[PDB]
Amino acid sequence: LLANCADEPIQFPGAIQPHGLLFTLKEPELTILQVSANVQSVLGKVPDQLAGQTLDCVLGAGWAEVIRSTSANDSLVDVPRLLMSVEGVEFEALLHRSQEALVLELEIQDKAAQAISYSERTGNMGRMLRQLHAAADLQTLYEVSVREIQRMTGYDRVLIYRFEEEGHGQVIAEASAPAMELFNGLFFPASDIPEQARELYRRNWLRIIPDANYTPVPLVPQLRPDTQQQLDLSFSTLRSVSPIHCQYMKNMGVLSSMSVSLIQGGKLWGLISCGHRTPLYVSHELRSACQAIGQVLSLQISAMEALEVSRQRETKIQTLQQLHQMMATSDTDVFDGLAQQPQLLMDLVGATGVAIIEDRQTHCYGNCPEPSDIRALHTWMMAGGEPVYASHHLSSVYPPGEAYQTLASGVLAMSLPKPVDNGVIWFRPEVKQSVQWSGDPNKPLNLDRLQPRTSFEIWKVEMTGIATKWSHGDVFAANDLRRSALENDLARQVSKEQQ
Amino acid sequence: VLLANCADEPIQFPGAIQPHGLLFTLKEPELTILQVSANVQSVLGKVPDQLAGQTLDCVLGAGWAEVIRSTSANDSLVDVPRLLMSVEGVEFEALLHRSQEALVLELEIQDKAAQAISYSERTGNMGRMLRQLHAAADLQTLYEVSVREIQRMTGYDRVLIYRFEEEGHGQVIAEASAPAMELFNGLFFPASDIPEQARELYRRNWLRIIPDANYTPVPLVPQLRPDTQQQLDLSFSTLRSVSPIHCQYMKNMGVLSSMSVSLIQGGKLWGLISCGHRTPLYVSHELRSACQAIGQVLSLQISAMEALEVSRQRETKIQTLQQLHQMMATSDTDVFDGLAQQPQLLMDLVGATGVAIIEDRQTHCYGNCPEPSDIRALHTWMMAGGEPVYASHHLSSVYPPGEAYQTLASGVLAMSLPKPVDNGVIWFRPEVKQSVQWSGDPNKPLNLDRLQPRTSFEIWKVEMTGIATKWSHGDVFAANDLRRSALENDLARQVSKEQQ
Ligand SMILES: *C/C=C1/C(=C/c2[nH]c(/C=C3[NH+]=C(/C=C4\NC(=O)C(C=C)=C4C)C(C)=C\3CCC(=O)O)c(CCC(=O)O)c2C)NC(=O)[C@H]1C
Ligand SMILES: *C/C=C1/C(=C/c2[nH]c(/C=C3[NH+]=C(/C=C4\NC(=O)C(C=C)=C4C)C(C)=C\3CCC(=O)O)c(CCC(=O)O)c2C)NC(=O)[C@H]1C
């Protein structure tokens, strides 16, 4: 029943939001296949008679000719601005193709939207990129990015919601209006954004919901007279959203949303979420500018993540070189010579326990668990086959790890690729962390049709059995130590065979 | 030595500024004038000699001096907004920085043509430009759209993407030229065009503009600051006189205006977005900053797609690497012998036409292989460096005895296991005859007379021999992965042999 949250066909809602008009048409002659029901009020045209008719009937001859010229022999990926005044109401036109048919969306521009101009709100664009490149911290990047986005959009709340591996996400940047609830640092259940929503947003990197009280406007005819199926509004900005999400936004107290998908290597790294207490529409030009800001944000995040990884590598290079020098001139087994100086090995990874296993002898330094427990863990670790392994919560993946979770809640293990059972394990003790959640972690939904949770208060969750995160430099140091041990061990076996 | 004189001039201390602006180096607290450019005798009509030890209120007015004082007070001078002033009826754009405990303020003179140009329309397609940059799937597309946008905003006839090489010389990879204008696409340029001093300066200052090449430098009076009795360091000053040799070089090219943005990748001068105009024309500082931001985005996207290409090569070589690893694991012989069991797969792993496998006084050659003695001499030379892997596209350049077999093996990709036993795998690529294009005389960078830039700018063919096809990033990745697999398998075999 929880999994029902990821079963709705969001790609085929059969309706569009009332803030615009939709026209799915045949490509060559621009004959109308289906039209949204909103044309009974806007432009005053009956949607039933608008079947198998050219765009000239409703949109006028000149605008239809312009659309025909634009869509002819074009990939529809570099279409310029298209603003039309159709019976005195202004529309911004976007073109794409769903299934061998031309889908055209007319976003209705109100007087407030017309007053807003793309020049002044994007005048500080170059200064914003200069600040982005000049920022030396990720927090500075987030702060200036959400500040600029709030400046152009004008929304009360702007969030940077980064997703985790399991699905749930965390807010890391917050820019809120006065007397407005703060979600900085709060974790949210994965049910807020289902797998279907994430999959859709991996392709469409821009979504806007001006109002949460809107009544969806159905598409007539519902079935296309081409394949007798439902129109795929996957890349359509004029797509009705699930009513559960509207109720969720109402429960949060916001009535307008605007999200830009952040993509890093084809994965939904995070979302630039936005929130307004009152309905308000954002022009498509500003939305595209925010999308470009999001792509630049992802690029700079990747750049500084690589910078941090290289900084950790540089600060661990000296320790790695010292350990390599000790290993090369020990004349004993590689891990024995490594264990000759235990404190240096400890500070190489910053762990409080060292366990070195070499063919039925295990040596423990510092805060070390029971040797039998470490042996059982080690024989479990070789089953995966990975040369190195890092785990910040051993009890989560290793059920018998709860007994010694107070002593060893973080395990960083690395072993040489030889039949002899050998390896090096670093243990980090548990740190008691009160993770902050927005609402009930154990009650994501008010089971009644699914209903979003009404309560949005901060809950403390004392998450036990989790140690300090292993940094990228930590696993880099483990891998470099493994490589040095490989080289030195090969040298020793070759020399021993020679002599 | 005399050629090295190209990298000895003190460009950071020219002692003069270009006439298209005004310079004011001042004391920080009271904004008292330390030195002022000599151009104030014509602009604003002030004697530069009497303007010593005087506040900015004397020349710049009370309100503008107060604004500058407020801006420079308790500020890092890295986020200063626009500063436009109308000083005795002529407009200036003000830039602030600090050289040595003193406030350096540059007033770029904005002409009527510059005033007519607005930052809105020329940057209206900014978001579309970034969308095109991110949507481009090829480096050539990136270069094309980048130079197209930069030419659109700047209006210059020629725009070049000049990427530097390791040795200093660079190559143009993007070209956007006006009709009836000479093309430099694909041409190589000698390293003497941009000396080491210029590269070092541009590594810090990522924006340079020279509106005119016939300008007479305007000296700074007093020449020596009455603080340390030294010369003012105009390293980060846009109003800095350039070397006359560079002006003569630009005149020889036929251009009278230049505009370059430094491209930085990991703290290194990857390349320059060079520009060229046949007539003098000034570009406002706002458009120059926008072009600088475009250059930084260009570098970021270049790095992104370079990583993408490296990962694509890794992916397309993963299957071959896995097959070779499977063959290595179940051979029961020596690692390189089992590797040599299938020579064609090893060849197509790196796309080389010669394979040489060395294992303890036996060398096995497959395909186009040199003389075994030559390969042995090369191999004993290779272990001297100590690098686990080595890639060379021109062996004769670094290995003098490699000219004998340059027709057969001009590219060497070698990888060896870290053991006392002399073992290794070498891949040989044959020489490909390439006619490198140079702009002018490669053997005569300068017309030795003071150094004089070369007058001739015609295309010269240079048949560069002894150079094989470049080893790709995927090539060295495959070599390193093969080395790692050989390391793991060899350790397993020695451990098993010791056990039994
Ligand atoms: C089990 C079903 C539920 C549900 C489904 C659902 N939700 C969306 C859309 C979104 N939900 C979002 C979540 C947040 N908005 C915020 O402001 C914050 C944090 C402060 C969170 C975690 C977001 C960002 C979206 C995207 C839309 C937007 O607001 O821009 C969908 C997708 C609907 C569609 O695209 O048509 C679905 C199916 N959400 C729940 O919470 C439960 C009740
Ligand atoms: C041995 C001395 C010489 C000399 C010195 C020199 N040159 C510069 C400045 C530049 N030279 C550049 C070269 C090019 N411009 C182009 O258009 C092309 C290709 C089509 C090339 C290779 C460039 C780009 C610069 C930077 C300035 C600019 O044009 O934007 C300096 C630096 C002077 C200063 O910064 O004050 C110096 C010392 N150049 C020679 O060719 C010889 C004669």
Numbering used by the authors:
A (entry chain A): 12 to 459, 466 to 516
B (entry chain B): 11 to 459, 466 to 516
What's in the article?
Pr/Pfr comparisons show that bilin phototransformation alters PSM architecture culminating in a scissoring motion of the paired S-helices linking the PSMs to the HK bidomains that ends in reorientation of the paired catalytic ATPase modules relative to the phosphoacceptor histidines.
BV was covalently linked via a thioether linkage to Cys16 within the NTE. As expected from other homodimeric Pr models, BV in both protomers assumed a ZZZssa configuration, and was fixed within the GAF domain pocket by an extensive network of conserved amino acid contacts to all four pyrrole rings and the B- and C-ring propionates. Besides the covalent connection, the PAS and GAF domains were tightly linked non-covalently via hydrophobic interactions within the figure-of-eight knot created by a lasso loop extending from the GAF domain to tether the N-terminal extension (NTE) projecting from the PAS domain, which was further solidified by a noncovalent contact involving Ile27 at the knot center. The GAF and PHY domains in PsBphP1 as Pr were linked covalently via the intervening helical spine and noncovalently through the hairpin extension from the PHY domain contacting the GAF domain near the chromophore.
